Design an enzyme around this catalytic site. Structure first.
Site, PDB file in Angstrom:
ATOM      1  N   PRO A 198       0.825  -1.213  -0.158  1.00  0.00           N
ATOM      2  CA  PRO A 198      -0.006  -0.084  -0.231  1.00  0.00           C
ATOM      3  C   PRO A 198       0.818   1.234  -0.207  1.00  0.00           C
ATOM      4  CG  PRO A 198       0.022  -1.136   2.135  1.00  0.00           C
ATOM      5  CD  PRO A 198       0.543  -2.231   1.176  1.00  0.00           C
ATOM      6  N   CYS A 220      -0.045   5.234   0.068  1.00  0.00           N
ATOM      7  CA  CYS A 220      -0.856   6.453  -0.014  1.00  0.00           C
ATOM      8  C   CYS A 220      -0.222   7.353  -1.312  1.00  0.00           C
ATOM      9  CB  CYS A 220      -0.732   7.435   1.171  1.00  0.00           C
ATOM     10  SG  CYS A 220      -1.711   6.570   2.565  1.00  0.00           S
ATOM     11  N   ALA A 222      -3.347   2.669   2.103  1.00  0.00           N
ATOM     12  CA  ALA A 222      -4.224   3.157   3.331  1.00  0.00           C
ATOM     13  C   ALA A 222      -5.626   3.599   2.984  1.00  0.00           C
ATOM     14  CB  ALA A 222      -3.400   3.694   4.388  1.00  0.00           C
ATOM     15  N   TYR A 272      -0.069   4.127  13.438  1.00  0.00           N
ATOM     16  CA  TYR A 272      -1.359   4.761  13.510  1.00  0.00           C
ATOM     17  C   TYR A 272      -2.023   4.066  14.616  1.00  0.00           C
ATOM     18  CZ  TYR A 272       0.680   6.476   9.187  1.00  0.00           C
ATOM     19  OH  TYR A 272       1.533   7.080   8.175  1.00  0.00           O
ATOM     20  N   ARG A 287       8.495   1.748  -3.675  1.00  0.00           N
ATOM     21  CA  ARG A 287       9.280   3.091  -4.299  1.00  0.00           C
ATOM     22  C   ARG A 287       9.432   2.511  -5.867  1.00  0.00           C
ATOM     23  NH1 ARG A 287      12.903   4.854   0.558  1.00  0.00           N
ATOM     24  NH2 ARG A 287      12.636   2.701   0.772  1.00  0.00           N
TER      25      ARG A 287
HETATM   26  C1  LIG Z   1       4.236   7.397  -0.929  1.00  0.00           C
HETATM   27  C2  LIG Z   1       4.363   6.212  -0.173  1.00  0.00           C
HETATM   28  C3  LIG Z   1       2.992   5.838   0.515  1.00  0.00           C
HETATM   29  C4  LIG Z   1       2.934   4.846   1.561  1.00  0.00           C
HETATM   30  N1  LIG Z   1       1.843   4.371   2.084  1.00  0.00           N
HETATM   31  C5  LIG Z   1       1.559   3.500   2.732  1.00  0.00           C
HETATM   32  C6  LIG Z   1       0.363   3.065   3.178  1.00  0.00           C
HETATM   33  O1  LIG Z   1      -0.482   3.893   2.923  1.00  0.00           O
HETATM   34  N2  LIG Z   1       0.133   2.008   4.146  1.00  0.00           N
HETATM   35  C7  LIG Z   1       1.256   1.469   4.447  1.00  0.00           C
HETATM   36  O2  LIG Z   1       1.306   0.423   5.166  1.00  0.00           O
HETATM   37  N3  LIG Z   1       2.844   1.648   3.992  1.00  0.00           N
HETATM   38  C8  LIG Z   1       3.090   2.700   3.008  1.00  0.00           C
HETATM   39  N4  LIG Z   1       4.025   3.047   2.658  1.00  0.00           N
HETATM   40  C9  LIG Z   1       5.396   2.094   2.922  1.00  0.00           C
HETATM   41  C10 LIG Z   1       5.320   1.317   1.879  1.00  0.00           C
HETATM   42  O3  LIG Z   1       4.302   0.303   1.768  1.00  0.00           O
HETATM   43  C11 LIG Z   1       6.786   0.284   1.910  1.00  0.00           C
HETATM   44  O4  LIG Z   1       6.847  -0.271   3.020  1.00  0.00           O
HETATM   45  C12 LIG Z   1       7.991   1.309   1.769  1.00  0.00           C
HETATM   46  O5  LIG Z   1       7.726   2.091   0.711  1.00  0.00           O
HETATM   47  C13 LIG Z   1       9.100   0.343   1.746  1.00  0.00           C
HETATM   48  O6  LIG Z   1       9.283  -0.412   0.702  1.00  0.00           O
HETATM   49  P1  LIG Z   1      10.433  -0.076  -0.606  1.00  0.00           P
HETATM   50  O7  LIG Z   1      11.633   0.168  -0.095  1.00  0.00           O
HETATM   51  O8  LIG Z   1      10.097  -1.016  -1.544  1.00  0.00           O
HETATM   52  O9  LIG Z   1       9.843   1.212  -1.068  1.00  0.00           O
HETATM   53  C14 LIG Z   1       4.231   3.869   1.835  1.00  0.00           C
HETATM   54  C15 LIG Z   1       5.437   4.326   1.351  1.00  0.00           C
HETATM   55  C16 LIG Z   1       5.506   5.410   0.247  1.00  0.00           C
HETATM   56  C17 LIG Z   1       6.792   5.794  -0.328  1.00  0.00           C
HETATM   57  C1  LIG Z   2       7.681   7.267   8.796  1.00  0.00           C
HETATM   58  O1  LIG Z   2       6.426   6.604   8.566  1.00  0.00           O
HETATM   59  C2  LIG Z   2       6.835   5.186   7.786  1.00  0.00           C
HETATM   60  C3  LIG Z   2       5.712   4.274   8.075  1.00  0.00           C
HETATM   61  O2  LIG Z   2       4.710   4.604   7.615  1.00  0.00           O
HETATM   62  C4  LIG Z   2       3.955   4.684   6.300  1.00  0.00           C
HETATM   63  O3  LIG Z   2       4.890   3.978   5.572  1.00  0.00           O
HETATM   64  C5  LIG Z   2       2.857   5.243   5.844  1.00  0.00           C
HETATM   65  N1  LIG Z   2       1.718   4.510   5.920  1.00  0.00           N
HETATM   66  O4  LIG Z   2       1.725   3.265   6.464  1.00  0.00           O
HETATM   67  C6  LIG Z   2       2.878   6.571   5.112  1.00  0.00           C
HETATM   68  C7  LIG Z   2       4.122   7.310   5.441  1.00  0.00           C
HETATM   69  O5  LIG Z   2       1.806   6.923   4.686  1.00  0.00           O
END
Ligand SMILES: Cc1cc2nc3c(=O)[nH]c(=O)nc-3n(C[C@H](O)[C@H](O)[C@H](O)COP(=O)(O)O)c2cc1C
Ligand SMILES: COCCOC(=O)/C(=N\O)C(C)=O
Ligand SMILES: Cc1cc2nc3c(=O)[nH]c(=O)nc-3n(C[C@H](O)[C@H](O)[C@H](O)COP(=O)(O)O)c2cc1C
Ligand SMILES: COCCOC(=O)/C(=N\O)C(C)=O
Lengths: 361, 359
Positions: free
Chosen positions: A22, A24, A56, A182, A325
């Site tokens: 997920p 956002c 989320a 959260y 990402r």
């Molecule tokens: C723009 C953005 C939005 C994210 N939104 C959520 C979210 O809504 N819920 C959640 O559990 N993690 C969220 N995350 C954390 C990601 O799901 C993921 O754990 C994080 O990007 C690390 O993985 P990566 O190194 O492959 O990017 C978000 C991360 C980013 C960069």
């Molecule tokens: C600094 O927070 C990192 C963990 O929080 C998240 O990844 C997230 N939602 O779960 C966001 C930023 O929307």
């Protein structure tokens, strides 16, 4: 290539082990998604990932992080997700959704618009709720209202209603957002939960909101579709051994309560931490949860290269690799991974109008 | 980085020199685009390219290449493009469209479904038209019907109607498809044009269909929006010096007729050729057309790495670099190029929900 083996959980089969976690987008209005999300999600699903978990999505208005967050707190909100669900499935990916409540981190600006709590003079803000009237601190100084027992009952029913709406919209995979500081994470952590009633203090009491929400959701979410949760298993706050042991015990209780898979993350409950960021750093922790709680897992935070993802699967540290990402950078990341790992007919990770031409390029 | 300097032509300003050239998707039904195209075009525009030219869009049903080709031969077909135009503009890119007629290469299967002419007995196919009743050959053996004078008037009017519809749908850039062995290229080439009337034989006569179509479109297309064409300037058929010279003379006549930019390509008129595929191989030919005809140009066919695209602009070989297949592989290719070339705040090639996190 282990990354490109299919995965079956309940009645759902994912075409590979690449999950989009997920993320956002902060582009919704009054909780309603729009053409930003439609294109964003459809494009990533066509990119080849086997599972796409939608960002989320708030179970109640005050549970959004920001005024741009998606919501599912009414049937109209749920209907808006139908074309997203259907476009993910049309691409051959599996649509999932994370349902969430931001707790004391709610009523914040979008990350590129200050990333901080909204000022009390700003007409966009709202009152936040949490287990105890304690602020996160730092850029999130607003003190939440401490929830009453009626609030706890109400929020649980909001999670139930959201799960039922997600089911009817056609999502085939649900993730309860119990991570990242959260609402759910903040009930579990002693940093944020100072309650003196049945929902605070002991391990059983701190676990109670999470277990009761899971059990209430389990009554309406179909037995044949994966029921999952994201949970921060440590904080990097100097209490890691005790916290990880408690978190793993909670994972055993989630399994006893019907959880099919755990997305293993970090708590982010307070700012006073020292998270050792690095490639695949969650690997050993996810492996321990998987082995000791005997539950399938995914994780994230640095697995976003084809070799790191492949190694984590071959080492049995993960069942699915969440790549976030890298999919914002390249919606077709799964195709890039297939080429790097030498998958046979790697271009056909993509649909025909792309695959036919990239086979000979 | 020259690749990320803006470009102004007429009243249109592109945010960088990266153009996505027309790329058929073969996903339309009865000419109508659908959710495939909506997401495909919107995602690429969000990727950062300054200009997105929508795929070859048929001015008439028999002018489609395949049963999956887009069309703009009715007002309802044009109205279907409106959300694509809106999504491209919303992403900060400029929406263009290539209007086309496949000529003797029409009535073919989709490329992953045989890529060949549909059998004359197969009800999915249709009769094709061309300057003369002569087949391309190879996998396209169907002999077209030689166009009548009424056919020529009708097809020109179809191009006019298509341009009017593209204008009213909000496209800010139009490209007449005069390349790649389709109808317009086949009028110019002596390989395919054996006509004995005013539309074949001499250079003036072979140019006539293209010049008259351009002039007819010019009447309905706004003066303040770029009017462009794609044109194959050589065939690699052993006649290159003579063909290139005549093609550059035609480009001079296009310029006199109001053309704002030429997409320089290869003719693909016949199969019996030896095209020297390689990195940026069109660079020197595009440069010669640009310099000799005094027209801005783009080109394609192997510029799809950041350094090759940057080199072509610095050497004044091109004004825009068309990057096609790399955008099918990665819709955000413009962002990848910005990072590679060290653009300041390269992540902001993308919209904020991506840019903030990739920085
Ligand atoms: C723009 C953005 C939005 C994210 N939104 C959520 C979210 O809504 N819920 C959640 O559990 N993690 C969220 N995350 C954390 C990601 O799901 C993921 O754990 C994080 O990007 C690390 O993985 P990566 O190194 O492959 O990017 C978000 C991360 C980013 C960069
Ligand atoms: C600094 O927070 C990192 C963990 O929080 C998240 O990844 C997230 N939602 O779960 C966001 C930023 O929307
Ligand atoms: C799938 C596909 C569809 C294409 N469709 C068109 C088209 O509709 N009109 C056109 O003039 N060229 C078309 N082309 C040619 C491209 O515009 C471009 O010249 C070619 O892909 C070479 O550039 P590249 O090396 O950056 O891919 C198409 C190419 C591909 C691969
Ligand atoms: C052999 O490739 C010929 C070049 O023609 C094109 O690029 C085209 N449309 O212009 C297609 C393939 O749809």
């Amino acid at each position: 290539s282990a990354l490109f083996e299919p995965y079956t959980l309940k009645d759902v089969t994912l075409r590979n082990r690449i999950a989009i976690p997920p993320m956002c987008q902060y582009m919704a209005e009054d909780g309603l998604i729009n053409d930003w999300h439609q294109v964003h999600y459809a494009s990533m699903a066509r990119g080849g990932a086997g599972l796409l978990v939608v960002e989320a999505t708030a179970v109640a208005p005050e549970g959004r992080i920001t005024p741009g967050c998606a919501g599912i707190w009414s049937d109209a909100h749920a209907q808006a997700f139908v074309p997203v669900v259907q476009a993910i499935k049309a691409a051959g990916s599996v649509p999932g959704i994370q349902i969430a409540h931001a707790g004391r981190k709610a009523s914040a600006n979008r990350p590129w618009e200050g990333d901080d709590h909204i000022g009390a003079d700003d007409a966009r803000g709202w009152e936040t709720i949490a287990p105890s009237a304690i602020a996160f601190g730092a850029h999130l100084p607003n003190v939440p209202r401490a929830m009453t027992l009626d609030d706890i009952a109400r929020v649980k029913q909001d999670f139930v209603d959201a799960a039922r709406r997600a089911r009817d919209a056609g999502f085939e995979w649900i993730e309860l957002h119990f991570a990242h500081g959260y609402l759910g994470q903040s009930f579990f952590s002693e940093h944020s939960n100072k309650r003196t009633d049945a929902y605070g203090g002991s391990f059983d009491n701190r676990s109670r909101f999470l277990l009761e929400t899971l059990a209430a959701v389990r009554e309406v979410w179909p037995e044949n579709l994966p029921l999952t949760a994201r949970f921060g298993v440590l904080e990097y706050d100097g209490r890691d051994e005790q916290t990880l042991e408690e978190s793993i015990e909670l994972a055993r209780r989630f399994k006893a309560g019907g959880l099919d898979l755990l997305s293993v993350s970090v708590g982010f409950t307070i700012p006073e931490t020292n998270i050792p960021w690095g490639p695949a750093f969650m690997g050993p922790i996810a492996e321990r949860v998987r082995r000791e709680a005997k539950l399938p897992v995914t994780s994230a935070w640095g697995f976003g290269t084809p070799q790191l993802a492949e190694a984590a699967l071959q080492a049995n540290q993960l069942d699915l690799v969440s790549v976030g990402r890298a999919h914002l950078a390249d919606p077709h990341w799964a195709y890039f991974a297939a080429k790097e790992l030498g998958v046979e007919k790697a271009s056909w990770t993509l649909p025909a109008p792309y695959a036919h031409w990239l086979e000979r390029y």
